[PDB]
Amino acid sequence: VLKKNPLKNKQVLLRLNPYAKVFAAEKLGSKKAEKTGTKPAAVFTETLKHD
Amino acid sequence: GKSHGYRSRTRYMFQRDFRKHGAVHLSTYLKVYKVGDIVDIKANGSIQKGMPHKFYQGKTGVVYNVTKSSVGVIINKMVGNRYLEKRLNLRVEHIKHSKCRQEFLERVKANAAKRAEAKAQGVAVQLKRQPAQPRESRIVSTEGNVPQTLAPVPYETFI
Amino acid sequence: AISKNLPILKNHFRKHWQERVKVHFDQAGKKVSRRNARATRAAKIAPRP
Amino acid sequence: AEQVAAERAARKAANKEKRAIILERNAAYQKEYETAERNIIQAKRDAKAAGSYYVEAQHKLVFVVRIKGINKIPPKPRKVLQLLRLTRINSGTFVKVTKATLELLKLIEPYVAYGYPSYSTIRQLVYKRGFGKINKQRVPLSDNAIIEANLGKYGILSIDDLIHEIITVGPHFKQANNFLWPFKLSNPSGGWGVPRKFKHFIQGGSFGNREEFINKLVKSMN
Amino acid sequence: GIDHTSKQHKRSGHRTAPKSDNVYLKLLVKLYTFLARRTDAPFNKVVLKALFLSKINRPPVSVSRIARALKQEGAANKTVVVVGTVTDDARIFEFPKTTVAALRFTAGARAKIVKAGGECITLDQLAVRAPKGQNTLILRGPRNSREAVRHFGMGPHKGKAPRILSTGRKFERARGRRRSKGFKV
Amino acid sequence: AKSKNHTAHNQTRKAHRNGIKKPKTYKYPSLKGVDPKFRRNHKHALHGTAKALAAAKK
Amino acid sequence: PSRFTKTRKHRGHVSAGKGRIGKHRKHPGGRGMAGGQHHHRINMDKYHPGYFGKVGMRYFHKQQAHFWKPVLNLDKLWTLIPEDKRDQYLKSASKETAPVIDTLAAGYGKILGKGRIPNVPVIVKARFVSKLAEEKIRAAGGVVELIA
RNA sequence: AAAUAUGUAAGAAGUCCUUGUUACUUAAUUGAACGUGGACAUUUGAAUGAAGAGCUUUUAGUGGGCCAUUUUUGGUAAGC
RNA sequence: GGAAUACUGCCAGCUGGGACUGAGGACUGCGACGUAAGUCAAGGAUGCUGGCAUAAUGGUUAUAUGCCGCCCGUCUUGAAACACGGACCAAGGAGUCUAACGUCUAUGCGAGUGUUUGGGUGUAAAACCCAUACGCGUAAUGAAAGUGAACGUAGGUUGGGGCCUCGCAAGAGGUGCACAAUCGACCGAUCCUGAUGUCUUCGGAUGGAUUUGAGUAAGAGCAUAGCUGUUGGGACCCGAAAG
Ligand SMILES: [Mg+2]
Ligand SMILES: [Mg+2]
Ligand SMILES: [Mg+2]
Ligand SMILES: [Mg+2]
Ligand SMILES: [Mg+2]
Ligand SMILES: [Mg+2]
Ligand SMILES: [Mg+2]
Ligand SMILES: [Mg+2]
Ligand SMILES: [Mg+2]
Ligand SMILES: [Mg+2]
Ligand SMILES: [Mg+2]
Ligand SMILES: [Mg+2]
Ligand SMILES: [Mg+2]
Ligand SMILES: [Mg+2]
Ligand SMILES: [Mg+2]
Ligand SMILES: [Mg+2]
Ligand SMILES: [Mg+2]
Ligand SMILES: [Mg+2]
Ligand SMILES: [Mg+2]
Ligand SMILES: [Mg+2]
Ligand SMILES: [Mg+2]
Ligand SMILES: [Mg+2]
Ligand SMILES: [Mg+2]
Ligand SMILES: [Mg+2]
Ligand SMILES: [Mg+2]
Ligand SMILES: [Mg+2]
Ligand SMILES: [Mg+2]
Ligand SMILES: [Mg+2]
Ligand SMILES: [Mg+2]
Ligand SMILES: [Mg+2]
Ligand SMILES: [Mg+2]
Ligand SMILES: [Mg+2]
Ligand SMILES: [Mg+2]
Ligand SMILES: [Mg+2]
C-alpha cells in the first residue's frame, strides 16, 4: 500500500539486500587502499610540463 | 499551360552517361531471369521500347513473368496512405540483378557452414550480427613517438 | 441529391399526394357493418341460403 | 490438516536458502567491482611508469534523461524519443552503447541530457525509483520475489542482480532494461546550474553528452 | 504532458456481456463465465465469447453440415457443439446417431436427430457432461453467405453486386457495364 | 475573388494518422498477367500431378 | 420514439449537429437525381454502373404469366412426397411400386438436376426437365413423363 | 559531385539433398513451373520499441484557412 | 625529500532543526533483533494531555482589503471592436410525420416466412381463431430465342480457433468449422471444334479458348421493432424580386 524507500528505512534495506549488514560491519564504504610507490617516467613529466 | 507528359522532367534521368553511348553490350541479353528474382530498374535511354516510367527509376522489384524479350516486375507503390502493387512489363535492357539478396544468401551459406562445423563440438555458435561495439582499452607508447605540441596559428591574408 | 452507396429509389410523391390519402380507420366498423348486412339479408330471405 | 505450521516452516526454510544465495552473490559482485576499479587505476599508473598512456575502454552504458517538454518536436526526433521510451520530461532510461544507439542519440541531442552513470547513481536510481513492467503494469519492486518471478529465467534473482546486469552490460541487458519501467525523475533540487537549458553542455547549456556530470545531475533529480 | 503513442481511454472493441436481455441467456453466460474463470480449458472461453455474439455472427448450422463434420476421421463419436441455431436439411437422406448441443433446434432438426437416434442437448447439460469440453467439436455456420455481404466493397473492377431494388433489362446493364455503351466498368 | 491554389500542408500528418501500413504478403500470389502458354501448360501439369498423387495415395 | 432521438441531445447546442460553416441549407446539390451526368457522376459510376442508356429490345404488352416456370432441383425433389410415406418409398427401392410425383401440382414448371437423389425409382411428371435431371432420374431407375 | 531526403534485403513462406507431372521448352531428363521424402530450432540469424496485431461495415463534420524557422518564385517593396 | 591541504568523487558513516501528509481497517507477506519466549521503526498513526461544549469552529450572506477579470450571441484566418442582433420581463417559439430504402442491433420462426385484403368470433375499433392466394426467399445467365449448377470423402495447397492421442511439462502427431490467399471443377453468355444420325438441312455429342456473369460448390431467409443515414414530400424554422 505504500512505497518505503531503501537508503532510508534500514528495515527495507535489509529486506532487499542481506549483504548490507556485513557491508556496514566491515565498513566497506571506507576501504583503505594499499600504498604503491611507483613513479611516472621522465618523458611523461617533461611532456606534461612542456610549453 | 502546365505539361505532364510521360517523360516529363526526365532529361538528366534518361541521359545515357559520359563516354558510354552507343550499343549495349551482350551480357545484358545473356543474363537469365527467373520468376522470383529480385531486380533493379534503371532505364536505358537508347532503348525506347519497354521503358519504365520515371517513377520506377531506382526501384527494386520481383520478377513474376518471363516473355520473349521482357520481364514482368512487381513494385509496391505508395498511393495516398497505403501501397498498391504495380505490374511492369520491362525489356531486359532496363533490368539488372540486385546484389543485396545474393549478399544475404552468401551470409546464410557461411552461417550454415559455421553452425554445422560447430555442431560436432558445441562451442557457443554466435551466429547473429552485432553492431560496431565501443573499442576496448589499449596502451599507447611514446617510443619514437614523443608527443608534438600544436598551437593555433595567427591570422594572415593569403591573397 | 445523389450521395453514398444506396439503391436508386422511385418514390412517386411529386404531386399533391397528401390530398389523396386513404387511411382505413374504418376497417373494424366496416367488418361489423358487413356482418350486420349479411344477417339482415339472411333474415329477409329467411329460408334461402 | 493444520496447514499453518508445516508448509509455513518449509516456505521459511526455502526463503533462508534464497537469502543465502543472494548474500553470496552480492559478496561476489562487490569483490569484482572493487577488483575492476583497482585494476584500472593500477593500469593507468603502470602506463605512466612505463612512459606510455593508458587509453581506457570506451563506455558501454549511458543514462539518458529527457529535458524538453512534449510540444513542438520534429517527427524523426519525436519517433526516436518514443522508441527510447522518453515520452515525458524528466524521464530516464539506460541505453547500451553501439553504433545504432549512438546514431539515435545524435538524432535526439537537443532534447536530452545523457552521460555515463556510475555504480552509486545506478544503485540509488534502482533502489528509490525502481519499477518493473509486469503484464503492462508499473509495479514497485520493493521485494526480491518480483524480480525472481519476472527475470528469474535469465539468472536474475534480486535487485542487486538487476543492478549488476545493468552496470556490467551483460547478455540479458536488453531484457533487464526493458523490464525496468522508465524512471520518473523530478526537477533537480539545486537547479540546473545554468541560466538556460537548451544549449549544448559545451556551450554552457544542458543538452548533449555531459560525460561524468550526469551523475551529479541525476542524483540531484533523484 | 505525455507524448502519447496510442489513443487514450479506448475501449477493447470486443463485446462482453451480450446485448440480449434474454434471462436464460444471461443464466447461460453466468454458468460459462464461472467455467471459463475456473477450469483453465480453452473451450469454455471460446463458447463464452460465442454466447456474446450478435445474430449475423451466429449463422445457423445445418444438419448436413453436422453430418459432414462427423464424417471426418476420428470425429464420429464427438459431441457437436453449436452456439446458435441448428436448422435441418432435406438434401441429406441418412443421418448418424450423434449428440448435438445447441442454443436452439428447429422442429425439423430436432426430429431428424432424434429419428436417427442421437440426442439434442442444451449448453448447460453440455456443461455438466463435459465441464472442460471433453471430446467436443465446435461448428460455425458460414458468415459470408448473407445477402448484405454481396454489396460490401462495391467499386470499379470489384465484381461486387450493386445495391438495387428492381432487376432485369434496363436496370443498370448499360453505359458502364458493356463496351458497346461507352466503357465496361 | 481569388483563393489558395494548392498545398500539401497537413497531408503527411493525415496519411500517418492510420496511414502507411504495408500490403499483406501471401503464399501463392495470383497468376494473372502471366504468359498464357505457360498457364495452359501449367493447368495440364497440375492435373497430371493430381492424378499421380491420387493413384499413389489411393 | 422521440425520447431516444439525437434531437433531444442537440438541445442547447447551437447548430443541432449540422455545423457552423456549412449549414443545413435546403438543397445544395439539386433535388432527387439531379446532375447524375454532371456534378454527381462519380457516385453514379462508382456505385451504379450501367445506369444511363438502353440495352436490348423492347417487348410491347408483356404478361408475366407466359413466362411462369418455377424451377425445382433434384436435391429437393423428394420433399414433394409426404413424410409418412417417404420412409416407406425409400425402403422399398423397387419398380412396379415407384411413387408418382406431380411437380406441376406441386407448382413447378421445370426440373433441374443439381444433384444426388437416392438410388430409388420415381415417376416424375413435369412440363420441362433439364438434360442432366432426366439423366440422373433415369440413372436412379425412374422415368420422366411429360405433361401439359 | 555532396549533405539531407529515397527503393530493396537482413530466413521456417529459409537453405540444401533426392526425384514425379506437362499439351510448355530443349538436339537431348535439357530446362521451366508446381509437386512426394529427409536434414538443419531458440543467438531462428542486426539494433531499439511494441502501448496489443490484423480485418470489416457504416456514418458526421470539413472541402474560405492563416502564422513561424529554414528552402523558394514574381515584385522597389508590403502586416503583398 | 617528506608531508599537508585544495578540488573532484564514494560510504548499505553518524547526527540536529523545519514543513506537508496519516490513505488503509481482524489475521495472512517479506524481513530484522534474540538460544528461546517473544519483540520491532517489518504489506499506510498511534500514545499522552488541555480548553470549549457553544455561534467558539464552520456554513450562508452583505461589505472591506490584496491580486486578477473587456459583452454576450454570430459569421470569420482573425471580435472587446469604430462588424451585425440585443432597452426590459412573461408566455409562445424551430430536425417532425409519412412512402420506399442502406448498415447495425434485438426478437420469433427457419428452407421457409408473413394471422389483421377477407372470413369466424367477441366482454365489440381490443383480445382470440382461420382457408385459398399473394409477396419476398429457396437459381442463375443471356438483348433474346433459350439453356440451366458433384470427376473427386462437394476438390487440391498454405494458414487456421477448438477438439483427440502421446508426454510431468516443453513440445510432437491427427482432425481441422468460420475466415484468408491461391490453383482447379460445375452452370449461363461469347468464340471455336463438329460424333452417331438425318424432313439434307436439321440435330449438337465430344473436346477446347490471354474472353465474360450481381452464379454453383451440404441453403439463410422472412417478419416485427429501435438508433443512425437516404430520397420524395411545406420537410429544422422565418425570408424574396417574380410567375
Ligand atoms: Mg498507490
Ligand atoms: Mg544519369
Ligand atoms: Mg513506337
Ligand atoms: Mg531552493
Ligand atoms: Mg533559466
Ligand atoms: Mg479553397
Ligand atoms: Mg490555377
Ligand atoms: Mg460542441
Ligand atoms: Mg450531424
Ligand atoms: Mg447557424
Ligand atoms: Mg452541406
Ligand atoms: Mg464554404
Ligand atoms: Mg466525407
Ligand atoms: Mg465531402
Ligand atoms: Mg569533499
Ligand atoms: Mg458565523
Ligand atoms: Mg469563521
Ligand atoms: Mg462572514
Ligand atoms: Mg458583492
Ligand atoms: Mg474585490
Ligand atoms: Mg486587470
Ligand atoms: Mg474579413
Ligand atoms: Mg477599431
Ligand atoms: Mg455597419
Ligand atoms: Mg449582416
Ligand atoms: Mg441593435
Ligand atoms: Mg417558455
Ligand atoms: Mg409462400
Ligand atoms: Mg391470405
Ligand atoms: Mg416484386
Ligand atoms: Mg479452395
Ligand atoms: Mg424524410
Ligand atoms: Mg414565403
Ligand atoms: Mg416565367
mmCIF file of N, CA and C in Angstrom, chain D residues 73-125:
data_model
loop_
_atom_site.group_PDB
_atom_site.id
_atom_site.type_symbol
_atom_site.label_atom_id
_atom_site.label_comp_id
_atom_site.label_asym_id
_atom_site.label_seq_id
_atom_site.Cartn_x
_atom_site.Cartn_y
_atom_site.Cartn_z
ATOM 1 N N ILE D 73 7.914 19.219 -31.391
ATOM 2 C CA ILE D 73 9.033 18.316 -31.627
ATOM 3 C C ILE D 73 8.953 17.840 -33.072
ATOM 4 N N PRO D 74 10.041 17.885 -33.835
ATOM 5 C CA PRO D 74 10.033 17.348 -35.206
ATOM 6 C C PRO D 74 9.840 15.839 -35.215
ATOM 7 N N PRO D 75 9.326 15.271 -36.318
ATOM 8 C CA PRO D 75 8.865 13.870 -36.279
ATOM 9 C C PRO D 75 9.954 12.831 -36.070
ATOM 10 N N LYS D 76 11.107 12.956 -36.732
ATOM 11 C CA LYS D 76 12.166 11.965 -36.536
ATOM 12 C C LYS D 76 12.731 11.955 -35.115
ATOM 13 N N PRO D 77 13.103 13.092 -34.496
ATOM 14 C CA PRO D 77 13.454 13.033 -33.070
ATOM 15 C C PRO D 77 12.314 12.587 -32.179
ATOM 16 N N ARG D 78 11.073 12.937 -32.519
ATOM 17 C CA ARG D 78 9.928 12.502 -31.726
ATOM 18 C C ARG D 78 9.797 10.984 -31.734
ATOM 19 N N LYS D 79 9.968 10.377 -32.908
ATOM 20 C CA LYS D 79 9.932 8.926 -33.024
ATOM 21 C C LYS D 79 11.083 8.277 -32.270
ATOM 22 N N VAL D 80 12.280 8.864 -32.335
ATOM 23 C CA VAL D 80 13.410 8.260 -31.634
ATOM 24 C C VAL D 80 13.221 8.359 -30.120
ATOM 25 N N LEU D 81 12.661 9.469 -29.636
ATOM 26 C CA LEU D 81 12.380 9.582 -28.206
ATOM 27 C C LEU D 81 11.334 8.568 -27.763
ATOM 28 N N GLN D 82 10.296 8.363 -28.579
ATOM 29 C CA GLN D 82 9.308 7.336 -28.263
ATOM 30 C C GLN D 82 9.925 5.945 -28.247
ATOM 31 N N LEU D 83 10.830 5.657 -29.179
ATOM 32 C CA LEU D 83 11.493 4.359 -29.204
ATOM 33 C C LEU D 83 12.492 4.191 -28.067
ATOM 34 N N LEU D 84 13.009 5.280 -27.515
ATOM 35 C CA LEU D 84 13.850 5.205 -26.331
ATOM 36 C C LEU D 84 13.055 5.337 -25.044
ATOM 37 N N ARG D 85 11.724 5.411 -25.144
ATOM 38 C CA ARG D 85 10.785 5.441 -24.025
ATOM 39 C C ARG D 85 10.910 6.706 -23.196
ATOM 40 N N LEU D 86 11.283 7.815 -23.825
ATOM 41 C CA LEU D 86 11.321 9.114 -23.169
ATOM 42 C C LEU D 86 10.119 9.923 -23.644
ATOM 43 N N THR D 87 8.943 9.559 -23.147
ATOM 44 C CA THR D 87 7.706 10.197 -23.575
ATOM 45 C C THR D 87 7.273 11.318 -22.648
ATOM 46 N N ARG D 88 8.070 11.628 -21.637
ATOM 47 C CA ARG D 88 7.735 12.647 -20.662
ATOM 48 C C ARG D 88 9.006 13.393 -20.308
ATOM 49 N N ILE D 89 8.860 14.659 -19.935
ATOM 50 C CA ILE D 89 10.013 15.407 -19.463
ATOM 51 C C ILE D 89 10.454 14.831 -18.117
ATOM 52 N N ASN D 90 11.772 14.843 -17.887
ATOM 53 C CA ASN D 90 12.425 14.218 -16.729
ATOM 54 C C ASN D 90 12.138 12.716 -16.647
ATOM 55 N N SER D 91 12.186 12.045 -17.792
ATOM 56 C CA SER D 91 12.140 10.592 -17.844
ATOM 57 C C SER D 91 13.500 10.071 -18.278
ATOM 58 N N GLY D 92 13.958 9.000 -17.638
ATOM 59 C CA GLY D 92 15.290 8.498 -17.872
ATOM 60 C C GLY D 92 15.290 7.012 -18.162
ATOM 61 N N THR D 93 16.282 6.600 -18.946
ATOM 62 C CA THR D 93 16.423 5.208 -19.353
ATOM 63 C C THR D 93 17.902 4.926 -19.598
ATOM 64 N N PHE D 94 18.330 3.707 -19.272
ATOM 65 C CA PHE D 94 19.658 3.230 -19.622
ATOM 66 C C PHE D 94 19.683 2.748 -21.065
ATOM 67 N N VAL D 95 20.782 3.026 -21.758
ATOM 68 C CA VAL D 95 20.969 2.616 -23.142
ATOM 69 C C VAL D 95 22.330 1.943 -23.272
ATOM 70 N N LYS D 96 22.346 0.764 -23.890
ATOM 71 C CA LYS D 96 23.591 0.134 -24.308
ATOM 72 C C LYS D 96 24.195 0.904 -25.474
ATOM 73 N N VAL D 97 25.508 1.097 -25.453
ATOM 74 C CA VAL D 97 26.183 1.907 -26.458
ATOM 75 C C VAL D 97 26.669 0.995 -27.577
ATOM 76 N N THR D 98 26.092 1.164 -28.761
ATOM 77 C CA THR D 98 26.574 0.611 -30.017
ATOM 78 C C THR D 98 26.474 1.709 -31.065
ATOM 79 N N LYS D 99 26.819 1.372 -32.308
ATOM 80 C CA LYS D 99 26.710 2.341 -33.395
ATOM 81 C C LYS D 99 25.263 2.760 -33.628
ATOM 82 N N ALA D 100 24.336 1.803 -33.545
ATOM 83 C CA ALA D 100 22.919 2.083 -33.745
ATOM 84 C C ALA D 100 22.372 3.060 -32.708
ATOM 85 N N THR D 101 22.601 2.781 -31.432
ATOM 86 C CA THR D 101 22.140 3.662 -30.374
ATOM 87 C C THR D 101 22.882 4.989 -30.346
ATOM 88 N N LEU D 102 24.149 5.013 -30.759
ATOM 89 C CA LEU D 102 24.855 6.283 -30.865
ATOM 90 C C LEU D 102 24.237 7.179 -31.929
ATOM 91 N N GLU D 103 23.827 6.607 -33.062
ATOM 92 C CA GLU D 103 23.159 7.421 -34.070
ATOM 93 C C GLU D 103 21.790 7.898 -33.592
ATOM 94 N N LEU D 104 21.084 7.079 -32.803
ATOM 95 C CA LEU D 104 19.851 7.557 -32.169
ATOM 96 C C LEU D 104 20.104 8.752 -31.251
ATOM 97 N N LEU D 105 21.155 8.676 -30.430
ATOM 98 C CA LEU D 105 21.444 9.771 -29.507
ATOM 99 C C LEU D 105 21.826 11.039 -30.260
ATOM 100 N N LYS D 106 22.569 10.888 -31.359
ATOM 101 C CA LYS D 106 22.883 12.035 -32.205
ATOM 102 C C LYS D 106 21.630 12.628 -32.827
ATOM 103 N N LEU D 107 20.616 11.803 -33.075
ATOM 104 C CA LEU D 107 19.349 12.330 -33.570
ATOM 105 C C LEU D 107 18.625 13.148 -32.506
ATOM 106 N N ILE D 108 18.665 12.707 -31.248
ATOM 107 C CA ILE D 108 17.851 13.385 -30.235
ATOM 108 C C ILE D 108 18.652 14.262 -29.286
ATOM 109 N N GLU D 109 19.846 14.680 -29.703
ATOM 110 C CA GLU D 109 20.726 15.517 -28.882
ATOM 111 C C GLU D 109 20.084 16.752 -28.240
ATOM 112 N N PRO D 110 19.313 17.602 -28.927
ATOM 113 C CA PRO D 110 18.824 18.825 -28.279
ATOM 114 C C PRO D 110 17.650 18.637 -27.330
ATOM 115 N N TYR D 111 17.226 17.415 -27.035
ATOM 116 C CA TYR D 111 16.106 17.203 -26.138
ATOM 117 C C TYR D 111 16.457 16.333 -24.946
ATOM 118 N N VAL D 112 17.708 15.905 -24.814
ATOM 119 C CA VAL D 112 18.119 15.011 -23.745
ATOM 120 C C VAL D 112 19.413 15.509 -23.125
ATOM 121 N N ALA D 113 19.646 15.066 -21.898
ATOM 122 C CA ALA D 113 20.945 15.126 -21.252
ATOM 123 C C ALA D 113 21.338 13.693 -20.957
ATOM 124 N N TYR D 114 22.522 13.293 -21.383
ATOM 125 C CA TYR D 114 22.928 11.920 -21.167
ATOM 126 C C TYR D 114 24.397 11.855 -20.804
ATOM 127 N N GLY D 115 24.785 10.708 -20.273
ATOM 128 C CA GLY D 115 26.170 10.529 -19.904
ATOM 129 C C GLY D 115 26.440 9.137 -19.401
ATOM 130 N N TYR D 116 27.526 9.008 -18.654
ATOM 131 C CA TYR D 116 27.970 7.701 -18.197
ATOM 132 C C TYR D 116 27.652 7.523 -16.723
ATOM 133 N N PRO D 117 26.705 6.666 -16.364
ATOM 134 C CA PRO D 117 26.328 6.528 -14.958
ATOM 135 C C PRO D 117 27.297 5.656 -14.183
ATOM 136 N N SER D 118 27.466 6.003 -12.915
ATOM 137 C CA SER D 118 28.305 5.239 -12.011
ATOM 138 C C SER D 118 27.465 4.257 -11.199
ATOM 139 N N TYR D 119 28.168 3.402 -10.451
ATOM 140 C CA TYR D 119 27.504 2.373 -9.661
ATOM 141 C C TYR D 119 26.594 2.980 -8.608
ATOM 142 N N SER D 120 27.039 4.056 -7.959
ATOM 143 C CA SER D 120 26.256 4.651 -6.884
ATOM 144 C C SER D 120 24.952 5.238 -7.405
ATOM 145 N N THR D 121 25.001 5.968 -8.521
ATOM 146 C CA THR D 121 23.766 6.544 -9.036
ATOM 147 C C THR D 121 22.855 5.486 -9.640
ATOM 148 N N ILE D 122 23.415 4.420 -10.222
ATOM 149 C CA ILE D 122 22.574 3.324 -10.698
ATOM 150 C C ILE D 122 21.861 2.662 -9.526
ATOM 151 N N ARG D 123 22.597 2.412 -8.442
ATOM 152 C CA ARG D 123 22.025 1.779 -7.262
ATOM 153 C C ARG D 123 20.951 2.648 -6.623
ATOM 154 N N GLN D 124 21.198 3.954 -6.514
ATOM 155 C CA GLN D 124 20.203 4.848 -5.937
ATOM 156 C C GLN D 124 18.967 4.950 -6.818
ATOM 157 N N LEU D 125 19.152 4.974 -8.142
ATOM 158 C CA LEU D 125 18.022 5.012 -9.063
ATOM 159 C C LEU D 125 17.151 3.776 -8.916
#
